[PDB]
Design a protein around this nucleic acid. Structure first.
Lengths: 122, 56, 209, 120, 114
RNA sequence: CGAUGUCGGCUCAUCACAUCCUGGGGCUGAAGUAGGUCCCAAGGGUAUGGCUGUUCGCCAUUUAAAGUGGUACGCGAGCUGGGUUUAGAACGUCGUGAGACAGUUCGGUCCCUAUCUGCCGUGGGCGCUGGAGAACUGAGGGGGGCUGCUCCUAGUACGAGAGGACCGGAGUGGACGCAUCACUGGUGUUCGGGUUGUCAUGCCAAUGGCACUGCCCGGUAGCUAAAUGCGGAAGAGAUAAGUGCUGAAAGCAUCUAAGCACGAAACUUGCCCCGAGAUGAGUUCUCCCUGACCCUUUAAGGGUCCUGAAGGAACGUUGAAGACGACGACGUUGAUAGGCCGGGUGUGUAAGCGCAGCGAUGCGUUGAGCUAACCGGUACUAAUGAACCGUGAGGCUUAACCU
RNA sequence: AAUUCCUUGUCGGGUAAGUUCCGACCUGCACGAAUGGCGUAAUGAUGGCCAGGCUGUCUCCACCCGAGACUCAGUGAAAU
RNA sequence: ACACAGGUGGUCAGGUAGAGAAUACCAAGGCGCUUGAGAGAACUCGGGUGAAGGAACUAGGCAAAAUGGUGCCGUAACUUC
RNA sequence: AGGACCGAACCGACUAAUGUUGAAAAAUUAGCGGAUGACUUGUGGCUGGGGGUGAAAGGCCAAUCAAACCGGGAGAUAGCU
């Protein structure tokens, strides 16, 4: 449950450290991002010689949320902190090569397959 | 917020058509004392359903 | 086809074998027993009137008792009526059980919803609240404007205002029937149906495709 | 909208209700019959009758547990010394309400609530 | 609700071990990856238990290679394959939500041993 | 001009179509994809932000699209009061000056308990022609109609290649609406616990009052949403633009004049709800009432006695019903409410006593004690015998039967 | 610029995006030296802008506690 | 104008905690505010709490939330020192 | 020491909400400024209407102020209603 104005952490090593969501893409008056949903972000903080510099505007996929995901048995999985991986803006599949922290079984799709090839858990 | 023509006494009585009080409609008679009371209530002498209660 | 009259027992869940919880509503459907059959030659329409449950002997009135006595059936807690579907045939006193839904795959459940009393327009009609601060003077949850100006100088019919929400007939359509249990007289449908626990339901087969 | 909630509010806050039923339970234990309003009687049942059942089992922990509720030591003498062994077989229903008219001052539906023995 | 009580206890698994909050628990969970049905392990401190018969849950908090994770589990789900108690834990509350604010040495639960 | 409050924002709409999207179609300088332009179409849908008082606009990023207008440039007895436009003050400029400038800047009171219409709900009376209890048909009225993306068909058709379909089907989203509380949560001043200050219960121990529930930590039921189910459809009929078939007037041609077939989210139905005050007051089933006697200005007239049915109403215990009425359940041949019993749940291992410790404390008895609205039972308490209202066979005419 | 109409001047900084804000330029419509010019530490219930924290302001409201509102008894207005 | 939530000078000033005449709870002493009983709708007022987000609100962080004590460490530009 | 700092009494009145046929013809509640001074307050006195007084607002001068209140000229005058 990520919306506009929300500061997310960064899970990959693309260079960003703290980003802000500026749109939730995927529909009209769509309010929330979520489990594996694409957002548009701006970069509010970076490390000094990363691939992405401060104030860039690009896409990301949310990989962890504090709200959490619900499994089909009723079980929830809440994290402690919202996190995203910065995808490339035009043709996706992300920028960074490492992925930190765990991810969830709901990025098990085509594209984000790359993200779960990395990513030490789940 | 305030009226614009004075209402009549017709409309006034029409509004009061429902302000009527209903009668009791019949009040019940005690078993022992034989005196009258509201139903499900105790009598003035303090009986209820033919037995003596309060007794003040 | 016809439906049957149930009773909302409550909600539970049904763990599937592959570990998917299904929220079900349990509807006890006892023997609905036909008290009247209606034909075109006497009524203009083909329909059965069923009863269900049981009522006290001293609480059923003489009109009602004479009706069930003619039908040759025990008095139930109510009378309902189902329109018939042109090739169906029922007799008076015939009992109908939950076994009828052993093929149906998806039903529509009709009950009276829970009465929420005099509700304001934020609960009732999802109006959006005005500012909670920034100057606002005694108008936080109020409905705003209700119409235009000299043209029309009237509030139109069916303007959304506040009043009684709840406690009315609602039908939920296309619910997946999870189990039919003829032993315990139960019907487990997937989802929530209208009404508080113990409320009378009407479960028909789904008319949608 | 209230659905299944229990407990009258009685146009008081929670601490004034709590205090009021503590006094009024004390008065019903003391005098064995009091005249109150009909709603205050009907709530006084749910406060008073648990003290009688607590009194049916005499121990130091129940004396102190019925002195936290009720806060009077004469009252927890009559409970545990008189009323608890008085009922002792009566399973609930320690008290009856008898409707008795209306006040003069404000036309309130009064009622005499009393303990269910008063064989004296 | 003898209908619902009778109907739920037909689904309750019988061998659920006795655990209480504060306990380190390994929970083995069926994870399905296409055709292969794997069984993975989630070990952490029980921070919360809801007892409602069939609808009994319990929340397990792990600090997974980075940040912290809370899985709430339905106890009587067929997904939840095994529960085993690793380290019995001595706490005073019933819901240990304060541990959401503590890491490392502050989030340290004494052992129960009785 | 004995006052019709004037921008903009909010809330809440509503209509038009000169249509932004979705739907149908003709021409194309239409290969496909994407377009351009024109006809039809008003069902539903039709952004969030930076700046600015701004409408507007520019910009950022979305979207199927971010329509154009009317409605006192809709909406201040609905809100705001930033702007304009009172009284203070200053700048630039004008005037000798008082002052002045839709030039600028800072500060600056927005009342109203609704009588009538309207509208949203909700009842009482009477009617519907004997009374009453139910179930209905349905005249009519309202709600609902949005849509993306992915996959298959098919990398086929088309194209030199790049690229890339129509028609048809499956899945899964967004926004919206209905329901619900099983799950995840919120609340939960009525449950349990921790703890600070102080006061009291004689005192220790234990408790209670007050300090925003003193501050907190959890939490039952209920209510709830961020939670979970479901929905918008298929189909039919009559069509719009459009496309035709046969076919003359006009021995050809021609979709039209006779005749015939297609044809869209619009229209009538299909789906959901209200609904016989539908005074055109309908239908069906069932239940109850089968006495005498006077008077007259002899009428569907009035009165007296005897009867009082079916049923309703009142009263009481009340409810996941409720502003109040209303509606639903129960009233002892009874689980309607309270209590009680058992369970569950929540809190988290009470008090007393014993042991260890100098002591704070810790350990044992002990997952203990206490547990609200929950669940299953139980007549212990309260739901009283009765009284009250409602009657006594239901008009006239005509017709068809009285087998 | 409390002063600038044209004007949201132009360039730069901050912002994803800045008619406001800061720095600069100077074509000062219509600054300017005690109706003082320009600086100015401290001060200000002063004006404008930015950031950290914090939050029901808001997304989008939900529940609860109280006082009215509603019903009963008593008294009993007002504008028009 | 009222038996009006306003105004009105001086004097005395106990306990516990506290720096204190603040503040909390109390003593002496005085009061419960001259309409009550219910119910537990919308809406208004005064408050409590709130998932994820955290100024996106808005004319403007208005309002609310937050901060808050004592001791010790430590503390920049600028400055009339 | 200080028109010094924090902060009650005391003086004030910056913001918001309520109130706006009020509890009140200017207040209440929650925050807010000063709080040894150009402070604040009691009792008495003095200044008066084109006059007073004014750290200046056209403010204040008995709920009245770009000229008080009362009485009189006075039935001012009113090509206006």
């Amino acid at each position: 449950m990520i919306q506009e104005q929300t500061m997310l952490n960064v899970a990959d090593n693309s260079g960003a450290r703290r980003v802000m969501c500026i749109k939730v893409l995927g529909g009209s008056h769509r309010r929330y991002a979520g489990v594996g949903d694409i957002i548009k972000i701006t970069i509010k903080e970076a490390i000094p010689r990363g691939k992405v510099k401060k104030g860039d505007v690009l896409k990301a996929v949310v990989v962890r949320t504090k709200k959490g995901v619900r499994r089909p048995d009723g079980s929830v999985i809440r994290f402690d902190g919202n996190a995203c991986v910065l995808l490339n803006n035009n043709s996706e599949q992300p920028i960074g090569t490492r992925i930190f922290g765990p991810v969830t079984r709901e990025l098990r799709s085509e594209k984000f397959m790359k993200i779960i090839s990395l990513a030490p858990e789940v | 917020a305030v009226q614009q023509n004075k209402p009549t006494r017709s409309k006034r009585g029409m509004r009061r058509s429902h302000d009527a009080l209903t009668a009791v409609t019949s009040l019940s008679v005690d078993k022992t004392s034989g005196e009258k009371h509201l139903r499900h209530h105790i009598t003035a002498d303090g009986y209820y359903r033919g037995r003596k209660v309060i007794a003040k | 086809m016809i439906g049957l009259v149930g009773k909302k027992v409550g909600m539970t869940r049904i763990f599937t074998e592959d570990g998917v919880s299904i929220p079900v509503t349990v509807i006890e459907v006892e023997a609905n027993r036909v008290t009247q059959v209606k034909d075109l030659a006497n009524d203009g329409y083909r329909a059965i009137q069923v009863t269900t449950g049981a009522k006290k002997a001293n609480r059923v009135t003489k009109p009602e008792a004479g009706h069930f006595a003619k039908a040759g059936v025990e008095a139930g807690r109510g009378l309902w009526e189902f329109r018939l579907a042109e090739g169906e045939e029922f007799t008076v006193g015939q009992s109908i059980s939950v076994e009828l839904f052993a093929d149906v795959k998806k039903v529509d459940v009709t009950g009276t919803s829970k009465g929420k009393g005099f509700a304001g327009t934020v609960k009732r009609w999802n109006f959006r609240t005005q500012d909670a601060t920034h100057g606002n003077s005694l108008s936080h949850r109020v409905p705003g404007s209700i119409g235009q100006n000299q043209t029309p100088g009237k509030v139109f019919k069916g303007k959304k205002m506040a009043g009684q929400m709840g406690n009315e007939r609602v039908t939920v359509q296309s619910l997946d029937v999870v189990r039919v249990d003829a032993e315990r007289n139960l019907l487990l449908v997937k989802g929530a149906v209208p009404g508080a626990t113990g409320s009378d339901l009407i479960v028909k087969p789904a008319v949608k495709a | 909208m209230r659905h299944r909630k229990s407990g009258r509010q009685l146009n008081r806050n929670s601490s004034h209700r709590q205090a009021m039923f503590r006094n009024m339970a004390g008065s019903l234990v003391r005098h064995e019959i009091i005249k109150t309003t009909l709603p205050k009687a009907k709530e006084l049942r749910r406060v008073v009758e648990p003290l009688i059942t607590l009194a049916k089992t005499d121990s130091v922990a129940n004396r102190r547990l019925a002195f936290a509720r009720t806060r009077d030591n004469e009252i927890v003498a009559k409970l545990f010394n008189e009323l608890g062994p008085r009922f002792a077989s009566r399973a609930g229903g320690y008290t009856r309400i008898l409707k008795c008219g209306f006040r003069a001052g404000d036309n309130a539906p009064m009622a005499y609530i009393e303990l269910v023995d008063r064989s004296e | 609700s003898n209908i619902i009580k009778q109907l739920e206890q037909e689904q309750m698994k019988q061998d659920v071990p006795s655990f209480r909050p504060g306990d380190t628990v390994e929970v083995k969970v069926w994870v399905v990856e296409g055709s292969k049905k794997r069984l993975q392990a989630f070990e952490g401190v029980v921070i919360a238990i809801r007892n409602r018969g069939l609808h009994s849950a319990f929340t397990v908090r792990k600090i997974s290679n980075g940040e912290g994770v809370e899985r709430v589990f339905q106890t009587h789900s067929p997904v939840v394959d095994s529960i085993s108690v690793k380290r019995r834990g001595a706490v005073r509350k019933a819901k240990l939500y304060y541990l959401r604010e503590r890491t490392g040495k502050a989030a340290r639960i004494k052992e129960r041993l009785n």
